[PDB]
Write an enzyme that holds these catalytic residues in place. Sequence first.
Site, PDB file in Angstrom:
ATOM      1  N   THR A  93       0.851  -1.221   0.000  1.00 42.49           N
ATOM      2  CA  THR A  93       0.000   0.000   0.000  1.00 42.49           C
ATOM      3  C   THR A  93       0.870   1.249   0.000  1.00 42.49           C
ATOM      4  O   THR A  93       1.381   1.656   1.041  1.00 42.49           O
ATOM      5  CB  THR A  93      -0.937   0.034   1.220  1.00 42.49           C
ATOM      6  OG1 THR A  93      -1.583  -1.236   1.368  1.00 42.49           O
ATOM      7  CG2 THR A  93      -1.991   1.117   1.058  1.00 42.49           C
ATOM      8  N   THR A  94       1.044   1.851  -1.175  1.00 44.49           N
ATOM      9  CA  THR A  94       1.835   3.069  -1.287  1.00 44.49           C
ATOM     10  C   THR A  94       1.383   3.919  -2.468  1.00 44.49           C
ATOM     11  O   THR A  94       1.278   3.429  -3.596  1.00 44.49           O
ATOM     12  CB  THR A  94       3.324   2.732  -1.414  1.00 44.49           C
ATOM     13  OG1 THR A  94       4.081   3.941  -1.550  1.00 44.49           O
ATOM     14  CG2 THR A  94       3.584   1.830  -2.609  1.00 44.49           C
ATOM     15  N   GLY A 142       3.662  -4.914   2.301  1.00 44.97           N
ATOM     16  CA  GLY A 142       2.374  -4.505   1.788  1.00 44.97           C
ATOM     17  C   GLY A 142       2.398  -3.751   0.481  1.00 44.97           C
ATOM     18  O   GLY A 142       1.331  -3.451  -0.061  1.00 44.97           O
ATOM     19  N   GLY A 172       0.523   5.583   2.735  1.00 47.86           N
ATOM     20  CA  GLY A 172       0.546   4.139   2.733  1.00 47.86           C
ATOM     21  C   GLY A 172       1.673   3.628   3.598  1.00 47.86           C
ATOM     22  O   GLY A 172       2.472   4.403   4.136  1.00 47.86           O
ATOM     23  N   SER A 173       1.741   2.304   3.728  1.00 49.95           N
ATOM     24  CA  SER A 173       2.748   1.673   4.571  1.00 49.95           C
ATOM     25  C   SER A 173       4.168   1.977   4.118  1.00 49.95           C
ATOM     26  O   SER A 173       5.074   2.047   4.956  1.00 49.95           O
ATOM     27  CB  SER A 173       2.535   0.158   4.596  1.00 49.95           C
ATOM     28  OG  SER A 173       2.713  -0.401   3.307  1.00 49.95           O
TER      29      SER A 173
END
Lengths: 240, 211, 227, 212, 232, 195, 208, 233, 231
Positions: B1-2, B169, B129-130
């Site tokens: 997630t980015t 992620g 995001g992560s």
Amino acid sequence: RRYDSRTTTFSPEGRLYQVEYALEAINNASITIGLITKDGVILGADKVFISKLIDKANNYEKIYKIDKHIFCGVAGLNADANILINQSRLYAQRYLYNYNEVQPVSQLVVQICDIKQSYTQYGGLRPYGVSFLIGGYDTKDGYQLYHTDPSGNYSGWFATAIGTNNLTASSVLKQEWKNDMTLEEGLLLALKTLAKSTDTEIPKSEKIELAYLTNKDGEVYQKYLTEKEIEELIKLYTQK
Amino acid sequence: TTTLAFKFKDGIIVAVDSRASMGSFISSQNVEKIIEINKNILGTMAGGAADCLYWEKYLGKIIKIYELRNNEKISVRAASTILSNILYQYKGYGLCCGIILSGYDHTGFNMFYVDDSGKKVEGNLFSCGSGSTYAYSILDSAYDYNLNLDQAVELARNAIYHATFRDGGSGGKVRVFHIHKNGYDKIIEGEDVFDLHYHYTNPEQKDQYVM
Amino acid sequence: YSFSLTTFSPTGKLVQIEYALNRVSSSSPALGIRAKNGVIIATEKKSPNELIEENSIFKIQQISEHIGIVYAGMPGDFRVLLKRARKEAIRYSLQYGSEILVKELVKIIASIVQEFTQTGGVRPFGLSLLICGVDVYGYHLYQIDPSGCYFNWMATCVGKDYQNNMSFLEKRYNKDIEIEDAIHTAILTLKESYEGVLNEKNIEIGVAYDNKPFKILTQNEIKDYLI
Amino acid sequence: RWYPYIDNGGTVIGLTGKDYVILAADTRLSLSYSIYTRFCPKISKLTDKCIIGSSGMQSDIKTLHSLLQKKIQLFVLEHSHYPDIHVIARLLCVILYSRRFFPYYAFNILAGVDENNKGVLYNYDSVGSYCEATHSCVGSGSQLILPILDNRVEQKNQLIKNTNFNLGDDINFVKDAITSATERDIYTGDKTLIYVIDKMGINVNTLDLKQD
Amino acid sequence: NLYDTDNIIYSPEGRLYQVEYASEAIKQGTCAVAIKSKDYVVVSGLKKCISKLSFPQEKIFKIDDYIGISMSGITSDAKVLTKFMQNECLSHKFLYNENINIESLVRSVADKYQKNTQKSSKRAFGVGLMIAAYHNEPCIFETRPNGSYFEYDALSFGARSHASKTYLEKNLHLFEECSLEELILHCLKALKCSLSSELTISNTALAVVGKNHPWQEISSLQLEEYLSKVKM
Amino acid sequence: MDTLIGLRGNNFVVLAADTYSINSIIKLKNDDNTKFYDIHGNKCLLLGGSIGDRLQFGEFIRKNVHLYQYQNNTDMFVKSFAFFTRKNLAYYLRRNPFEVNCLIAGYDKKDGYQLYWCDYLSNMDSVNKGAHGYGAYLVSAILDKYYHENLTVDEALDIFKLCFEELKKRFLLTQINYELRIMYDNKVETQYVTV
Amino acid sequence: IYNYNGGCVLGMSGSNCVAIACDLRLGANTFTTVSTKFSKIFKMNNNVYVGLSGLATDIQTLYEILRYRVNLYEVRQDAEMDVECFANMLSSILYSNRFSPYFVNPIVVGFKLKHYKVNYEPYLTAYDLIGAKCETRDFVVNGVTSEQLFGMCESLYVKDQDENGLFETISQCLLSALDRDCISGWGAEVLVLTPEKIIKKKLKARMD
Amino acid sequence: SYDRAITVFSPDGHLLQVEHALEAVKKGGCAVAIKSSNFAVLAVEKKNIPKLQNPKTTEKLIKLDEHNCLAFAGLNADARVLVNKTRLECQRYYLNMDEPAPVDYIAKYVAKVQQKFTHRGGVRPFGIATLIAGFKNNKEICIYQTEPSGIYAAWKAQAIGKNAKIVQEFLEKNYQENMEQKDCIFLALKAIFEVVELSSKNVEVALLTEKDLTFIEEQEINSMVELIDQERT
Amino acid sequence: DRGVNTFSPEGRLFQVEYALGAIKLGSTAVGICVNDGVILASERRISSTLIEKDSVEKLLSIDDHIGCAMSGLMADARTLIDYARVECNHYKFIYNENINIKSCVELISELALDFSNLIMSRPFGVALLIGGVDKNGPCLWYTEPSGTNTRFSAASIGSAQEGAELLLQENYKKDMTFEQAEILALTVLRQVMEDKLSTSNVEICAIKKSDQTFYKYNTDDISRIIDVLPS
């Protein structure tokens, strides 16, 4: 539907036919006066005589107080006047609660005229048949005097009269009123106007009431003249 | 997630990965984290996928309503404010949407950051995001205004690569879009990160790369 | 479906309120007097046949321990207004923990009557109340009207031929009248207005005796006063 | 102190080709460790060229399928044209997101053939997120099966590569995958239904698996 | 005279004039005709054409598999009723997984009619419906602006319904135990008689619903073939 | 977390706030502009706390005050502004808590130059100086030591410089950049300082 | 909860003279004083005063509500409110929010008017946060320092007294009570109201 | 009544209530508005009783927003309530969009509310005609005019109120584009005085620019009225 | 004298009939549909010269693929347009595809008839032409206060609509090309219009099958078309 009264509906000329009747009823009530001076604002009035058994002490039927700095005079139906006075007190105290300061008079008159207009537009309920002369004092603008009506129309004034024979009272005010006036001279002029409008050469101490608001010592306060005080005032008037 | 975005001479550059995770397991490797909210405004997705997607499309509907009614293109500021207000209405309900709205309006090029807690912020460089920290570090170390479009896209791709490298992620494919005066273009629609790593860090395929 | 059945006519005059006043003017008369150390409300009930029980119909009621009330008009409106006044006094006491001031209660009742003559779908009350009481600020005697406007009296009458009764009451009245003299004057005025012969069970009287609870005279006391 | 969520278990698989789509599903309904019945289909026919499969709470999936069918019927009545697979997908996404705070415990796969004769397969989540894919699996066996499909179709980590695929080979691969899932999973089931959607209508076949 | 200002006033003779005017509006509409036999129910109607640059307005409607209706009167009220009936049938099938009982649906629509008729500040629907369906048996129902419904063997609506009704009563005995094709022919005869100036594939609507025969409007080619058959 | 400082004195008022937008463990911006809200006329509101909460509350209060001023054709008094803000904050606290600390400041022709403290529970009270946030613990004492009647604006800025140096040197979260709002002589001036 | 912004209010009666005193601290997080002018005593009527202690926001809200109600009553009746009526209305207002109440412990102090000439009688009372009225006719205390004030007043009260003695006793009791509390103090204010006049003074208390 | 139609079509197809409201509008005071380049001029008449009325009370010309300005003619109470509604909507827009409300949006909103009060039961039409002047979102000056029926239109120069036709006819033959400030004020005063008794106490003109609404000083108005009176004779 | 929803002795609601009478006045508009797309044109009855001519628009867009032209009470027409566009965008949100023209007309008619309880307070008194393109083809519809909407091949609304529609039926023919439709529509509008046709005196809009996007002809296109129209 068949019994509907046609209250909130424009007339063929745009008058609603109900505000007009309320105003014409206003014109039949006793006269009320209003003056602004260098020392305060006056709302001299004329008491309608019902009988000789009314409680002379206190019993003010024409001049009321809405707050420590606001006080007005009625020229119409008494019940509508009482309910609207109650609403004025609630509005002023609600403003003080909200903003921790006394409400300027303009806001109060605006709110009163707003409720009157709401009654004139929404629903099918008849309009309030009462017109006030709200007068008071505040730091933002100083001594003020307004004049409402059943249609929620308001306008400032330096000196005016409402009710029966308001025309003659206004003529006298325009003939005699001056920009800078003392409180005593204002009281004398109010007595003269009440006498002329009432068609009486000498006003009777039992047929009139007077009051005035002044910001003496930085603390606004109102005074409602009593029988002895008004008697002395009329003595001074006849002296002059 | 980015998700990543920044502003430069020729407009705005937006970049995203494609990983989607249900915890330790990746449900899908190819997803679209960039939505064309308007003909000139884009918004990325971070956190709750369903919440972000649904609210982006709701904002698109509202933007269409306003544009059609008033007969004028909306500004990124107004869209960001609307999104922030609607997200704030659901405060304390579990929404976990973090958005970056970037686009061109009559005022110029604009970019805003919005959060599930009504956190509206304005800037010219953002990442969420992560893997956001890695992208920030790679950008700030080498980011600079007034660099050509090719350099901008290369920097964005490198930042996304490095974010994916050190994040479980983040991964899948690299998508890089460019926003300019007249709409936007998809410079990189999808790029497998496999060859990207084996081209950047370990150009020679001998022995495991040690780090 | 909710519109005002009472509306301004040319010149206003609120014709419905005029008709309510006419209704009041045709009912049984009732008067009140404010004395030096007390207040009296008296009324006359038409000679009842042997079947009616005067102990079941009362034109004199008490709202609080110090406040009495009389009416002249429609009995049902009187009953509902009396219940509402009792509730108003109770809710005032629940907050301020004291007997409701007479002026305050008069204001609430007048406001209620005003709302009833303003609201749509209803018609004005057809009675003219009369509230007497004692409080920290001396004695009080007020009169409500269907129009909803109250007056502060010291001696007044309402109902049939109220003009002549008012004139008679004014002729014989003084600010320093004693309570017993006030009772006698009330009896005389009622007898003059009756146009017949009065006796026990034909009148009702209530009095607020100084710092004592409001009390409604029993038939024996009224008979003793009559002699 | 009552939890309104129980997993009835099961597996649904979906694969796509050039102009056809295959959707297989178990037919076992079960509880924590015991089986209610040996037959409870999970694939509901939405339109003539679109079907939906689901895994999770049996009541939730049944209600969702019935509601979606009602919506589709109302749409076709009011607009005189059957909705496309994209329209149905978006409608299902909206329905799922409606209950964002009491979500359905149903993982959904929507298979169909677009108006251009393309096999389309949408995979969803319990809250509403959906994404198109060329292969998917949901239910208990999702984790066991997804790697096999990825190796077969995507064919990454390979050098020789082989993309020559037809309907028969795809069907056989699906049968092998479902059999393997049954072997290596306990909630899978015992009898499976295979729906094949092609340009010329749709067909349904049945296969028998192990009973353990 | 003065008892027709409201729908809540009974005239000295005891009649609601507003509901009668609604029935008048129903009668003023276009034509329609419905017939049934041992199997299959046939509905036919005239799609009104206002100008040569206007396609004829839709006349028949489908409420659910095996259920269709025909309209006569105000179109907006017809749309409202059709939406209500479609929602009712779909909800019943959703939450019971079975077809709705036709009579219950007719009762529901009649109750809606009655409710709109009862309370003041509302008007009665000025539209008449001709419900045709096959719930294990062919059925035809008619509904009126006042809450009232009936079940018929042959029905007609508005326009010059006199001719259609005369033809129907003249041939009612032959309808039962008759083939579907001949039933369609008879329905076309009735509509043509009502026309009183020709039938074309554009201005005529036809539908059939029967055993193993979901409600389906007749195609253009089949309709033209039937029209040619009746013409000769 | 968000440091606010306020110093009021005869014929001058000064507000100071660090410029930082914290998200998780990083800074979205070093030039945060969500802390200051200037009301039409001579009035300023400084908010500290969660970015979204302060944004919502500040926008609400500022636009309500603007509505009042336009409707009544005048300028709200500073005391009225402060007490209206306190009442709104208390109301929302009772229903929907607003985790935001308030520093109201302004100039009025009636009461002169004035400043008002306000805790996140609406524990508002007039004050000659104050601070909000953890950094408050490191500045209040200094403000006491160097403050004295008949102060001048330059001395106020010197005190603020001392406070900024103290935060930079001793405060866990080393704060460097600050924004200053100076109200005096019927002028509102904005400055940026970096220690 | 009451430690946050601690406070102390006290009141005493004498011979035709009454006194009400309070602390002037406004703190935060218990152990951090923020302001030294927050006065707990508010004038509600020419001869009626209320001293509120507790959460400052609650104090302000209750004071505003009371001012609204008192002004409304006074305007409607065109006369001054009585201490009995004010006390009863305060009890009713406090009880109106029995659930989710106002975290304030007020006390009412003033003159009861006995008309007949006229007489002034001291009137005092203290309340709980629900409105648990309890007349005492002598010293009243309220706040986090209630125990110390109780002890000091019990030891020092001298029944009826001259206004000078009343001021001395109340000031000494309050100063002693505050000196033994850490979250209260930072200056004290005393009001001595009598029919003829009203004196307000501030003590040279331990301001640290 | 309550919640029941008060304005309904007549046999000819006219809403008589709307026509009566328009007639009431025609009874009110006059007003004029001009625009040019990047500034506008608003003029309104005035009628007060000498020596008694307070001129400061009249607010025929008002400011709605930071930039928008409004003038009206008709029932005064209706004008005030509608103005309060418009200001509230201005602030609501500035909340939900974080940009000042453009003139076109506010004109559309006034038209919408006037239409709503004409199409709902239990309420009678607003008997006022208004004209707003402001800046579009693209920093362009524009003035709109709204009538009781709810129909609104953008104008370059327009007059409303008593004899609005005569003032409109005068404007149509004298208006020029991108005029100077002095010339714009001169034209505004001429247009208002075409139908209004000639005196400096019967007009309160003002000028709107990006900066703010500025009321023209009484001395300037006196000079302008003297000049136009001299030109007339 | 009577309520809004009282039936007449003939079964026609009085208010609806009065609205039908009212809609007979206003600016004239025409519309045509052909195998390539739909075209709408309006008279553009310009008032005094002091108006901008941009604010007064008789051709709005319900959506990207739908255009409209109104007549009668303008305020009610704008309310209807707002509701129609809101519902069309709601449809687009609920379903990815665009709303069919027929469905939009159905929603508009439903809102128009809402006034009868079975909220608004009286019939709208507006007549609309809604033209557009969908997968089913290009088509235009006509809507009136009574609620009865009808598809049209070539129609006209507003004052003098009788002559406009008479000319349309006299001239309109199927298989017509888009240029032929444009010239025919402008010729009819010129014939019915009172003043001399000019670039600023008329407005046109069109939707194409290929683009499927609403497109309003500007001054240049209008002049180009005018030059070629037959004299």
